[model samples]
Target: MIITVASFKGGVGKTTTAVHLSAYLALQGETLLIDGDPNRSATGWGKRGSLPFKVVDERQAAKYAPKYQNIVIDTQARPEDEDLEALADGCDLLVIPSTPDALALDALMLTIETLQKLGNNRFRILLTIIPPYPSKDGDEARQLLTTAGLPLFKRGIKRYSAFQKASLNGVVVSEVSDSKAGIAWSDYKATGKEIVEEILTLEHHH
Candidate 1:
């Protein structure tokens, strides 16, 4: 399975999701994370720490692709229109992550619009960095997306500084010592489960 993560804007946990999801994928099989993002965020995340899977740049992907059963790609943020098509066509599923904010949502719509125009629907929108309860932002945005009939994950990734801590330590969120680290990791784990049992399962049935 090849899962590519892209976003119209940054700071939406694009690389973070790629990293954690790759970690989860490794549990199922040998996984490789291709850091296609120019920022090299995923590569940096794996430098100081030991990740279960291999991390390689896009240029090096061909050399290592055959060794892994699952591959997760972290694509460049706000890709140009011309590059978007290839990114969509190259992956089994494209994951678009967006924060529950007006600016991020606007960017998200633009990305989705391009995909729709390209006749590509093999994508899922993931809400990330959701503010904790009482904010109502995440729920409200989720409902609005549902009303528009957008494909989205049922679980949204909640906000936590523990993610930064994990990045600093070059480890997955679950390895961090913060109190909310487990909670943060649970969000991605739920997403990983959804991808395997729900999204991909439904696709195979079709």
Candidate 2:
């Protein structure tokens, strides 16, 4: 299935989420990562260098997505682009990665509204860069989205330094299992599993 990670705003870790999720899924088996963003951050990161699966350009994805068991799209943040919207419309699942900030949440609302208007409802909001509990702010953010009626994944990614380290090393959190970073890496794996299971279950019901 095609899974697209997108956002209407930048710097919200959209590309990072795509890379880590794609890498984690690749560990499970064969998968294709499509760097649809013009900046090609995912392609650059994947090329520098080796990854568990192949990374290709958007032009080549049409040929590979249907052939591969799992295809992940690292989409551009421009919601105004018709091509981007078309891609989102075609995906089996769309993951919108956003921060806990109010502005980000507002943009997310717009995104959800647009998708709903287009009759595309198979999507979920993923909270990223969230601080671990004991921090009351995280609770507040969760409550905010809950009140807005958005379905959020139970597993939120904390603002761990290990994520940055793993990115710099051109590896996923799941692969870095020997350091303090492993704790955060473990979170990624768990979250990835949750997402994959949810997607599979959705497909089964359909």
| Alpha-carbon TM-score of each model against the true structure | 0.91, 0.84
User: Model 1 clash tally?
Assistant: 0
* Model 1 bad stretches (over 4 Å): 77-79, 82-84, 117-121, 202-206
Clashing pairs in 2: none
For 17-122, candidate 2 gives per-residue lDDT tens digits of 8887777787776889888888887787776656677889999977877778778888765745554457556677678888888787778776655555443246
Alpha-carbon RMSD, each predicted model: 2.0, 2.8
Each prediction's number of clashing residue pairs: 0, 0
lDDT of 1 by residue, 42-107 (tens): 899999798888999999989999888999999855554566678767777778788999988988
Estimate the lDDT of model 1.
Answer: 0.84
